[PDB]
Amino acid sequence: SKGEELFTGVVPILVELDGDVNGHKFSVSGEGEGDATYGKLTLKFICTTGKLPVPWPTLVTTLVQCFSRYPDHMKRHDFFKSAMPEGYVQERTIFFKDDGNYKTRAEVKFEGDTLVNRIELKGIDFKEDGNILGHKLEYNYNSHNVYIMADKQKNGIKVNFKIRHNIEDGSVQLADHYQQNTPIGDGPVLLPDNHYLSTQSALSKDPNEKRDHMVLLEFVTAAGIT
Ligand SMILES: [Cl-]
Numbered sequence: 001s002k003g004e005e006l007f008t009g010v011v012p013i014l015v016e017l018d019g020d021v022n023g024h025k026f027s028v029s030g031e032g033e034g035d036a037t038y039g040k041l042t043l044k045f046i047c048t049t050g051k052l053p054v055p056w057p058t059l060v061t062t063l064v065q066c067f068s069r070y071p072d073h074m075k076r077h078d079f080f081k082s083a084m085p086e087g088y089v090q091e092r093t094i095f096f097k098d099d100g101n102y103k104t105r106a107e108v109k110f111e112g113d114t115l116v117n118r119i120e121l122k123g124i125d126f127k128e129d130g131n132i133l134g135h136k137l138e139y140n141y142n143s144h145n146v147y148i149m150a151d152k153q154k155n156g157i158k159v160n161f162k163i164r165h166n167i168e169d170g171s172v173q174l175a176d177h178y179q180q181n182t183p184i185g186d187g188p189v190l191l192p193d194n195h196y197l198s199t200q201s202a203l204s205k206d207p208n209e210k211r212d213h214m215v216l217l218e219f220v221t222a223a224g225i226t
Contacts, residue, residue: 002187003084004075007036007066012114013043015063021123022100022133024053030063032216034115036081039069041218046211054123055137056214057165060201061094061177062104064117065146068197068220077192077225079148079157079181085110086185088156094163097174100126109184131165131173138166143200146220150191156182157192195224 015030032043045056045063052059066080080088087109094102106119126133142164151158159179164172183189201218 001082003066003081004078006084006110007034007081009037010035011067013041013064013067013117014111014114015043015045015117015119017059017063017119017121019054019119019121019123021054021102021121022126022128024133025049026053028052028059028063030117034064034067036067036069039067039220041067041216041220043216043218044206045214045216046209047213048211050212052212054132055135055139055165057137057139057141057203058096058102058132058175059121059214060141060203060216061163061175062092062102062106062119062121063216064108064115065090065181065197065220066108066115068222070222074195074222074225076190077148077195077222079190079192080108082188082190083181083183083185086183086187088181088183090179090181092177092179094178095176096126096130096132097176099130099132099173100124107184131167136168137173138168139203139205140166141201141203142166143198146197146199147194148192148196149194151180151182152191154180154182155189155191156180193225195222197222
C-alpha cells in the first residue's frame with residue numbers, strides 16, 4: 001500500500017523541537033535514521049540553545065511511530081504508515097506525578113525522502129526543585145508498552161501508557177501519557193483494533209560531543225493481536 005511502501009528501507013529522520021517549561025525556553029535538533037523492517041531508530045539529539053532545562057529521558061517520548069515494526073498479520077492496524085506521506089498530527093498531555101505536565105503538538109510527515117517530526121512543547125506547574133527541573137532522574141529509559149485504540153470520531157487513534165523515570169535515590173517518577181493522532185491529509189487511513197507497541201530504548205553519550213545531547217537506539221514492535 002501507499003504509506004507502507006515508503007518504509008521498506010532505511011529512511012533519514014529529522015526532528016526539531018521548540019519548548020518552554022515553566023518559562024525555561026530551549027530547542028532540540030535531532031538527526032538519524034529509521035528502518036521499520038526491524039522497528040529500529042538510531043538518533044542523536046542536540047540542545048541547540050545551551051543546557052537542556054529538563055532531563056533528556058523526559059523528552060524521549062516526545063522526540064515517529066511510523067517506524068514501528070508491524071508484523072505482517074497486523075498490517076491493517078498500522079495507522080502511522082497509512083497516513084503517509086501527508087502525515088499526521090500527534091498531540092499529548094504528559095502528567096508527571098506530583099509535579100507539572102507537558103503538552104505537546106507535533107506534525108510528522110515526509111519532506112522529500114526525509115521523515116520529519118516538528119514539535120512544540122509546553123510545560124507548566126513544575127516544581128523548580130522537583131525531579132524534573134531539579135535534574136534528579138537517571139539517564140536511562142525502561143522498556144514499556146504503548147496502548148493504541150481507534151478514535152473513529154477524529155479519523156485517528158487514541159493512545160495511552162505509563163512511563164516510570166528512574167529517580168536517582170532509587171524511587172520512580174511516574175509520567176502518565178495521553179496521546180492522540182489524526183491525519184493531516186484527507187486520504188483514507190487504517191483505524192486499528194486494540195493493540196500495543198512494545199518499546200525499548202538505550203540512551204548513551206557521544207564521547208566527542210561537548211554540547212548537551214542524547215544518542216538513542218530504539219526498537220518498537222506491534223503486538224497484541226493473534
Ligand atoms: Cl532504580
